[PDB]
Amino acid sequence: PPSDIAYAELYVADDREASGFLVDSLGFVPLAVAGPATGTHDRRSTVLRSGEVTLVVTQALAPDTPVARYVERHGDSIADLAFGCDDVRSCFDRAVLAGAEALQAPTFATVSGFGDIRHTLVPALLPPDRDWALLPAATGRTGPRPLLDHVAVCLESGTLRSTAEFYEAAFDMPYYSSEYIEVGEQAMDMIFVRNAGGGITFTLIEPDDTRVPGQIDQFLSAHDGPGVQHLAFLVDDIVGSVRSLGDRGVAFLRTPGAYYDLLAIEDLRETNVLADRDEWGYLLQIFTRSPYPRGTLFYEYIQRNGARGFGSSNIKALAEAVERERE
């Protein structure tokens, strides 16, 4: 089965705006591009990289193409979470066996997943379905950080268990941990799934329909269905990163000073970074505001100092920061 996430592909209405924020604010570097001059007539795509995180930003160049249809439905959104496989044929078979729809058969392959996401399957390197014109930066060595810590996915009520069962069977990503999180009168249920290697961690999040609609329901109506709510990037110095990023225009969600009174500490306070711990050490986390029109996808920065999993105290204070922002 898949060892790692190869890349995430963002479908967008305006790649100037979307890639501009990822490059000029977050610091991603363009590596390669595809478009009419490389034989890809219906869209322009750009591969961006930072450390080991690869994002592909893709914009339709004609109305009523699949990309254009996707973006009209969902807004700017992740449409593809690509898996790197030691043996693609084997990954594809195991996935179809588990009930994954065959969206394109091994010509590299594409299977379905939660909501209308795609999972392109690729050798564990740029996407294999299009031909790429390289930038000079593509020919140079990349840092080991940042790396993609986990992907958070919003699911419709009553689909959490069967989504998790699918990911266990299709991709060998079994249960890792679960949390039930309450904010005000709303709540959400989540399961973290993770493969044996630890290369792939998803947060599967469903809203609790026995409580009052909240931020997960809002995500689902804005995005118009299940989708990726956030990508989290693992960094060595989240305080430093949040300082430089803040300088390049990045808006992070704020936490009240109250939280810091309870809880180095002056550094976290200043940066609105959240701290929690597991049996093996601490983790620091922060969310950015969504930079997209519908207020859906956003980014997370995480630093692990020994922590292997996730802390229920950070999850709650993150979800509180999103609600303060939502209002």
Ligand X SMILES: O=C(O)[C@H](O)c1ccccc1
User: Would you list which residues are annotated within the binding site for Fe cation?
Assistant: 150, 230, 300
Query: Scanning residues 295 to 324, which ones bind Co ion (CB under 5 A)?
Result: 300
Closest CA to 51 of 14, 85, 7: 7
Nearer to ligand X, 34 or 319 (CB): 319
Interaction between residue 172 and Co ion (CB under 5 A): no
Q: Does the protein bind ligand X through residue 26 (CB under 6 A)?
A: no
Q: Can you list the alpha helix ranges (DSSP code H) found in the chain?
A: 15-20, 66-74, 88-97, 160-171, 215-223, 238-247, 257-262, 265-271, 312-326
Among residues 300, 249, 240, the alpha carbon closest in space to that of 270 is found at 240
Q: Given the rule CB under 6 A, which of 30-38, 104-112, 239-247, 314-322 is the region that contacts ligand X?
A: 314-322
Query: Strand, coil or helix: what is 296?
Result: coil
Please give, one letter per residue, the 3-state secondary structure of 228-290.
EEEEEEECCCHHHHHHHHHHCCCCECCCCHHHHHHCCHHHHHHHCCEEEEECCEEEEEEEECC
Task: Please tell me what DSSP assigns to residue 211.
Answer: S
Within 104-163, the residues that bind ligand X by CB under 6 A are 150, 152
Binding to ligand X, residues 218-247 (CB under 6 A): 232
* DSSP type of residue 156: -
**205 is in the binding site of which of Co ion, ligand X, none (Cβ under 5 to 8 A by kind)?**
ligand X
Backbone angles phi, psi at 307, to 5 degrees: -55, 135
204 near ligand X, rule: CB under 6 A: no
209: helix, coil or strand?
coil
Q: Is the separation of the CB atoms in 7 and 84 below 8 Å?
A: no
Which listed residue (205, 228, 245, 274) binds ligand X by CB under 6 A? 205
Q: Is 285 in the site for ligand X (CB under 6 A)?
A: yes
| Least distance in angstroms from the C-beta of 217 to Co ion | 18
* Count of residues engaged in binding Co ion, rule: CB under 5 A: 3
Q: Which stretch binds ligand X (CB under 6 A): 9-17, 44-52, 98-106, 311-319?
A: 311-319
The answer to the question of residue 8 lying near ligand X (CB under 6 A) is: no
Binding site for ligand X (CB under 6 A): 150, 152, 190, 203, 205, 232, 285, 300, 310, 315, 318-319
Binding site for Co ion (CB under 5 A): 152, 232, 300
